[PDB]
Amino acid sequence: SDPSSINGGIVVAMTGKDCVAIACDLRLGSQSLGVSNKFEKIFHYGHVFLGITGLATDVTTLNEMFRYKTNLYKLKEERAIEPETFTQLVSSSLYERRFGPYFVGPVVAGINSKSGKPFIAGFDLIGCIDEAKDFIVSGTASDQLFGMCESLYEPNLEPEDLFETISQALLNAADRDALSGWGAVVYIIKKDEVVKRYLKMRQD
Template sequence: MSIMQLNGGSVIAMVGKDCVAIASDLRLGNQALLVASNFEKVFPIHDRLFVGLPGLASDVFTLHEALRFRVNMYRMKEEREIGPETFCHMVSSTLYEKRFGPYFIEPVIAGLPPVTELNPNPKPFIACTDLIGCITTPKDFCVAGTASEKLFGVAEGLWEADLEPEDLFETISQTLLNALDRDALSGWGAVVHVITQTEVTTRYLKSRMD
C-alpha cells in the first residue's frame, strides 16, 4: 500500500466563468478504519485563494502551517495579498526543498487573481503539484487523492466551459459525490467552496456513510 493512501481523501478543483470551485471529502481514516468524518483538507489562504492538501494527515497539518507562515511573511513584506500563481510557485518551492524526505501531499490550488488596471478581467487559476512540487496548470479541472481515477472519469463527462457559479457548484458536487461512491478510502461527507470576485460560498454535502 502507498503511504499516500494511508489516510485516504480526495480533492478536486474546477474552473468556471469568472469563478472557480474547490471541493474535498471529509473522511480521515487509517486504511479501511474510519477515524473521523470532519477532517478538513481545503484551507483558505485569503478571500480569493484556497489550497487543498490530500495525502498523509500529519503532513497536512505540517505543510499548512509552513505555507501559512510563508504567506504571512509575504503579506508583511509586500503589503498585499499573494496572487494564485505566485502562491503556486511558493507551494512548489516549499515541497522541492524537502524532496529527499518529501511531504506526502499532492496540493491542489484554486483562486482568482485580483482585479487591477493592468488586468481588469483576470482569469480563474487552478493548479496541482506532485509531492516534490512539479506544477500542472490545466484549463478545466484538476484532481488529487485516492479517488483521482474516478474523479477524472466523471469530470470528463460533466465539465463544460464557462459555467456560472451555481452551475459550477452543481457540476463539481455531482462529480465529487459520484466518485466518492466508488472509492472506499474517501467519502463520509464533502465540502465545496465556490469563489467569485465578490464572495466565497461554502456548502457541506451529505454523502454515503458506509
C-alpha cells in the first residue's frame, strides 16, 4: 500500500578519483512475490547516468520522460546535457508534480565533460536535491546502504577499488532487505569509458 515499497529495489552512487560509480539491484516484485530479476534501474542520456528506485511504473515513466527531454535538449543546444544541468531538470520535473508526485528516489551520477569533475546527486520524490561529495543512496534498503557506505567509503578511490567498495555496499545492504536483490549491476564511469558489471549474488 505504501507506493514506494510495493516493488522494492535499491540504487547507490559513489565518487572516486576522476570517476563515479552507480549501482542497483535487479529485482521487481509485487510485495512478497518476486516477478522479475532483470529490472535494471539505471539509465543513461549521453554520459549522464540516472538510477531510479520506487514504484516501477514511475521508474519506467520517468526514464521515458527524461529520454524525451534530453533528446529535445540535445537537438536545440547541439550538445549533450551535463550532470549538473540534468540534476536541475530532474528536480524541476519532480516538483511540477508537487501535489501528485512520482513515487521515486532518483540518483544522478556522471562526469562533467568540460571540467572533468565527478558528480553525484540524490532527490526525494518531490525534487529536493541532495548533492553529496561522497555517496548517495536510495530505495527500500537505504538505511542498510547508509550503514555500509558510511563505514566502507573513503575518498579518492581508484576506479577498480571503487568498484569493490560500491559492490560490497550494495550486496550486503540488499541481503538485509527482503525486497531487494535477485541480481545487481555496477557501472564504473570515467571521462571516456564506462564499464558495466553484473554481480553474482544469492537468489533468495
